[PDB]
Each structure stands twice: as C-alpha cells, then as structure tokens.
Write a protein that binds this ligand. Structure first.
Ligand SMILES: [K+]
Ligand SMILES: [Mg+2]
Ligand SMILES: [Mg+2]
Ligand SMILES: [Mg+2]
Ligand SMILES: [Mg+2]
Ligand SMILES: [Mg+2]
Ligand SMILES: [Mg+2]
Ligand SMILES: [Mg+2]
Ligand SMILES: [Mg+2]
Ligand SMILES: [Mg+2]
Ligand SMILES: [Mg+2]
Ligand SMILES: [Mg+2]
Ligand SMILES: [Mg+2]
Ligand SMILES: [Mg+2]
Ligand SMILES: [Mg+2]
Ligand SMILES: [Mg+2]
Ligand SMILES: [Mg+2]
Ligand SMILES: [Mg+2]
Ligand SMILES: [Mg+2]
Ligand SMILES: [Mg+2]
Ligand SMILES: [Mg+2]
Ligand SMILES: [Mg+2]
Ligand SMILES: [Mg+2]
Ligand SMILES: [Mg+2]
Ligand SMILES: [Mg+2]
Ligand SMILES: [Mg+2]
Ligand SMILES: [Mg+2]
Lengths: 116, 122, 86, 137
RNA sequence: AGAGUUAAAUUAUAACUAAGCUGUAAAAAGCCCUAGUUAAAAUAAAAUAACCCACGAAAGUGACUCUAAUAAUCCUGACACACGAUAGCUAGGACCCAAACUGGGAUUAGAUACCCCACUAUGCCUAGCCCUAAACCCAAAUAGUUACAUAACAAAACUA
C-alpha cells in the first residue's frame, strides 16, 4: 500500500513539523520515463584466464592449447551474437509491461487534472 | 501481580537449584515483598553465551517470580541479585497483566490526502 | 560472536551447483537491505544527510507506487479500439 | 526430492554425511574479499589452518590484485594446496563485500575443491565504531 | 533527570598458519611489533522495526529495565525570571574510533587544496561558563470563514 501522505508536507494548517521536503511537487505527469540502457561488462573472462594458463605453461604455443583456443573463439562468437541482437528485440519484448511509447499514449487518454 | 522477576539460573542439579530459589525468595521477603507464585520454564539452551561472574554459560534454567513490592525497594533487589553468583542475568519488569488490553475496533483506512497544491495550470 | 555459527545468512547448494546458490544468498540480503546498508557504512554520512536521504527515498516510493497503481488500473484499456474510423 | 536451504542443526541428527563425515566435521574456507585484496584461508573443523592464499602471494601486485581475475587465480591456488592435504568438501564463509566474492567462490570449484554451504559473515555494526569521513572526489 | 544493564562491530592481549599488509582513476609513502583464523575486557556509538510520525515550550529525543514525571476549569503579554544544537574556555577522569592543526606521499606551472598514510585538540563522563546558527516549516499567538477573489513564484484566499 502507498505510504500515507497525511500531515507530512509543510502546510499552514499543519501542526506537525514537516517530515517530507520534496524537490519537485508530487504531481503525476502524463508520461513515464524511458527505459535505462543496461551497462555492459567484460565478457569471456572465465575462458580467457584458462587460455592464458596453457600459453604460460607451453611457451606461448598453441600446439597443445587447441581445446582452450577454440572455446575462446566460441565465447567470442557467443558474446557477439547476444550483443548484436539484444537491442532490437528488447524494445518490443516488453517483459510483459508495455513499452514507454505505448504507456505515454495510454496516459494521454486519461490525463491527470491538477487544475479546476 | 505488580512486578515480575525474569530470573535466569545457572544449570545445576536439583538440591542446589532449590537452595538458590529458597534464598532468592528469602531476599525478596526481607525487602518487604509479598510473592504470589513461582513459575518454572524449565532448562533451555541459552540463545547466546552470556558472561557473568567470570564464567561463560551456554545452558541455564529459567524461573519467573511475581510479587508486590514498594517502588523504592526495586534497586535493592536488583543490586542484591547482581552480587549473587548462581544467577546469571536478573531483570525486573512491571507485570504485563497490570495493563489492560485496550479495546480495538479495526484497521481504519486512511484516504489519500487532497488539496496539497494550488489549482494553477502546471 | 556469542551466537552459534553457520545458522544465520547461510544457504546450502543442491545438485552440485554453486552459482545458483550464491544468487539465492544475494536475494536474501537485498530483500533485507543489508547490501545497501554495507554500501552506506563504508563511509560516514552526517545526520543532516541521513534525513535528506530518507526524504528522497520516501518520496520516490510514494510516486512510484502511485504511478504503478494507475498503470495497472488503466491496463485493461489497451485492447484494440472497437470504434476505429468512427 | 525435498531439499532444505537451512543448514542441518547440530542439535538434531540429520542423515546427510559428505565423504563419511558429518556436517560440522567438514573444513571451513574463509574468504575475506576487501575492496583491494582477496584473502583465502582453509581451516579444519578444529580451526587448524591447512593452506593460505591471496592475490598478493600469487604474483598480482598493487591495483591488479583487486580485480576479479586475481581472486579467481587465488581460489585455484588455494584449492590445489588444500587438495594436496586431502580435503574434498569445504564450507565456505564469505567475509565482507568486494569485487572478489564471485571469482573466489568459483575459483575453489575449478581448483579441484567442492563446496556445499555458503555463509556471509560481513561485519555489520549495530549502531559501533564511527567510520571514516566521505571522499569528495 | 537519576540508578542499573548489553546485544552486533572494533581494540589491548594469546595461540596457529602465511610473507607480505594497507591504499588509489593510477601510484608512492606508511607498516612487516604485520595479515588471516580461534578465544576476549574497557571506552564509544545505538543495524532491521521506521513505507510508522509519537513526546517536549524551543533547541531536541527513537538499545533494554526500574524510580520520579510532562504548569493553567482549558485568551494576548516584555528590556523581567527560566532555558537554549554545535563549536569554544576552566578543573578532574576516560580514549575503541573519527578527527581541524601538523608531518610524509602523490597531483599541479605553484597545491601551505581536492586524493592517500600517521597522530593531537576535541567529539565522551562529572562540576562551572559561554548564550551564537540557513536557532528556517524563512509563514507570530488566540478564535474562526470558503464567502469576496488568481501580480509573479511558492506551501490557495481572508476576517476579529
Ligand atoms: K542498537
Ligand atoms: Mg507538537
Ligand atoms: Mg526547491
Ligand atoms: Mg560484544
Ligand atoms: Mg545525567
Ligand atoms: Mg614502498
Ligand atoms: Mg593482528
Ligand atoms: Mg585500554
Ligand atoms: Mg521524525
Ligand atoms: Mg505551550
Ligand atoms: Mg501540558
Ligand atoms: Mg501569558
Ligand atoms: Mg549552548
Ligand atoms: Mg559542546
Ligand atoms: Mg566541548
Ligand atoms: Mg580565556
Ligand atoms: Mg579539559
Ligand atoms: Mg585523543
Ligand atoms: Mg586514528
Ligand atoms: Mg604536505
Ligand atoms: Mg532546527
Ligand atoms: Mg526568523
Ligand atoms: Mg518562529
Ligand atoms: Mg507572541
Ligand atoms: Mg498556550
Ligand atoms: Mg489557528
Ligand atoms: Mg502568466
């Protein structure tokens, strides 16, 4: 449930001292904020480290590191595939919640009335 | 009842436990207290190790004493139990039955508050 | 220090995986708010900043939980309009 | 297959023995993951240390030792020294919050050591020493 | 305002293992009488509850227990009486930890600053003084009205 907004803000007819001092007025806007892009992180680290172990153990020659080298290539392709497809599908995937453009139109049909 | 004595005793055999309660109740009667009854909560493992009288205790017995005593004699009872070595942690609180359960009607729903801002065009 | 060990904030792995068990532990701490608490105890915030932080956390929790209700309330009005080109 | 997250309480008798020994008999792996270093120590059920390893001792130096990879290598090294002394399962206790928590956990997994229980024992003062002031970076 | 009490953390200190430990955007300096684990006083500060809004005249108060206890049969009122965060002073006691000043490192053209390490006054207890704050909810006290009516902005306007 929503926290009570009774006797919180600084008002003339308020005996209780202020509890909340908002930066901007608590008025619902007719639009929601855009989704925030997820910050990236380095990929293929658990596979690069094991690759470096074989290189240091065999004088930097891939004559015996073939198993590790291929997985590093596989991880690079796997990370490449996911990175070059996340942006397009996430816009309309919606995770069950309408994209920001649809919510803005929905809110405009039923706007908030501060005046009158 | 007016006062309740949350008494915790060190784990020991039957004879010394009876002796410890016998003298603890005797100390209460010397200060001018009419004890009502003695309640036994059995022996239980302590929630955490309690350091008292240069000992580390992990198991102890719980006992409860309720009595009527003058207000000025509470400090003497607390001071006396602190010097005793067979009691690990004494505490005195007013008996919960002294206060009556205040009558309740229900969870009154608080409506959302309006008229918090001017009606000018934002 | 005085309590028993390996009871609080402890999870046990199942079927031999450890990444899944660790994520369960993090959800336990995040829900109880310990993760943010440890972040704020690395340095010291003056009581002036503590109240100013609780006046921004509470205000956000009111606006977010109120805009959330309006979205759910108006969610049913998203079907195809039956009076298109009326 | 009813599996309970909570540990088997010592007071009760749970028929869950790993490698023929009880829950409390299994050694402990302490992980102190600070913001600049990750220290891993494995101790026996009697709190007798078996092996010790950290990002500093593995060749990583200065800022490098605070990264995740350094903690991952320390987990591999600590497990190898532990496995040499003949330990299969270990109950890992995580101390503090840092960038090396995840790497050290899977470092022991890939080093030839198996974990069964995870505990977080981050120092959480209940009101305690006043910490240092803020950094106006 | 008194009296009694301590959960979590930290430190003196002891045992064991390890050779490094702290620190940053990156480093150096410092430490190696050190770090990790186990055992553990004193001092200081009061996680979650608190998405609650209570008490006091204000400044203030939110770890536990007990004692004492919150004026007026319920208007306004000073230069008079009483009080007043924090910093500061005088005397004694305490000192985990934080920390103006100061010393070292780094940055910079310079850095007597921001950043890093060490430590003092002091923050703490008892008795006295000082009586200052953006002491600001920038909105005086007591009774009321929603009538009349939008400079602007903000926390709508007004009468006795
Ligand atoms: K507390
Ligand atoms: Mg009031
Ligand atoms: Mg403003
Ligand atoms: Mg303690
Ligand atoms: Mg006092
Ligand atoms: Mg040096
Ligand atoms: Mg030490
Ligand atoms: Mg001392
Ligand atoms: Mg408040
Ligand atoms: Mg008054
Ligand atoms: Mg009154
Ligand atoms: Mg008067
Ligand atoms: Mg003063
Ligand atoms: Mg002062
Ligand atoms: Mg002073
Ligand atoms: Mg002078
Ligand atoms: Mg002095
Ligand atoms: Mg000092
Ligand atoms: Mg210091
Ligand atoms: Mg200098
Ligand atoms: Mg004020
Ligand atoms: Mg004024
Ligand atoms: Mg005023
Ligand atoms: Mg006046
Ligand atoms: Mg009055
Ligand atoms: Mg009024
Ligand atoms: Mg205009």
């Amino acid at each position: 449930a929503t926290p009570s907004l009774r006797g919180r803000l600084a008002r003339l007819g308020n005996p209780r001292r202020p509890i909340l001092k908002p930066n901007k007025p608590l008025i619902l806007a007719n639009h929601v904020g855009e989704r925030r892009r997820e910050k990236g992180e380095a990929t293929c680290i658990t596979e690069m480290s094991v690759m470096m172990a074989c290189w240091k153990q065999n004088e930097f020659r891939d004559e015996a590191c073939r198993k590790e080298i291929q997985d590093f290539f596989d991880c690079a392709s796997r990370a490449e595939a996911a990175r070059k497809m996340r942006s397009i599908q996430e816009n309309l995937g919606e995770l069950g919640s309408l994209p920001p453009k649809k919510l803005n139109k929905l809110l405009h049909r039923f706007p908030n009335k501060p005046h009158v | 009842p007016r006062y309740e004595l949350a008494l915790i005793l060190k784990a020991m055999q039957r004879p010394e436990t009876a002796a410890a309660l016998k003298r603890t109740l005797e100390a209460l009667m010397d200060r001018g207290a009419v004890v009502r009854n003695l309640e036994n909560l059995g022996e239980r493992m302590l929630p955490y190790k309690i350091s008292a009288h240069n000992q580390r205790h992990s198991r102890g017995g719980y006992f409860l004493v309720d009595f009527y005593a003058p207000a000025t004699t509470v400090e003497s009872m607390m001071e006396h139990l602190s010097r005793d070595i067979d009691v690990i942690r004494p505490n005195i609180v007013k008996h919960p039955l002294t206060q009556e359960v205040k009558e309740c009607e229900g969870i009154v729903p608080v409506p959302l508050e309006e008229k918090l801002y001017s009606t000018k065009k934002r | 220090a005085n309590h028993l060990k390996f009871i609080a904030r402890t999870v046990m792995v199942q079927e031999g995986n450890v990444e899944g068990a660790y994520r369960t532990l993090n959800r336990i701490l995040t829900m109880d708010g310990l993760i943010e608490d440890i972040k704020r105890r690395r340095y010291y915030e003056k009581p002036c900043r503590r109240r100013q932080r609780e006046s921004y956390e509470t205000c956000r929790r009111i606006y977010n939980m109120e805009m959330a209700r309006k979205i759910n309330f108006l969610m049913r009005k998203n079907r195809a309009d039956p009076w298109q080109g009326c | 297959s009813s599996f309970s997250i909570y540990p088997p309480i010592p007071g009760q008798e749970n028929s869950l023995r790993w490698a023929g020994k009880k829950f409390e008999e299994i050694p402990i792996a302490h992980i102190k993951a600070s913001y600049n270093n990750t220290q891993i120590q494995v101790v026996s059920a009697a709190h007798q240390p078996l092996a010790h390893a950290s990002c500093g001792t593995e060749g990583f130096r200065n800022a490098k030792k605070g990264t995740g990879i350094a903690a991952q290598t320390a987990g591999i090294a600590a497990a190898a020294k532990a496995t040499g002394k003949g330990v299969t399962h270990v109950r890992v206790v995580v101390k503090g919050l840092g960038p090396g928590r995840l790497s050290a956990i899977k470092g022991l997994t890939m080093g030839g050591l198996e974990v069964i229980s995870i505990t977080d024992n981050t120092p959480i003062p209940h009101x305690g020493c006043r910490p240092r002031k803020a950094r106006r970076l």
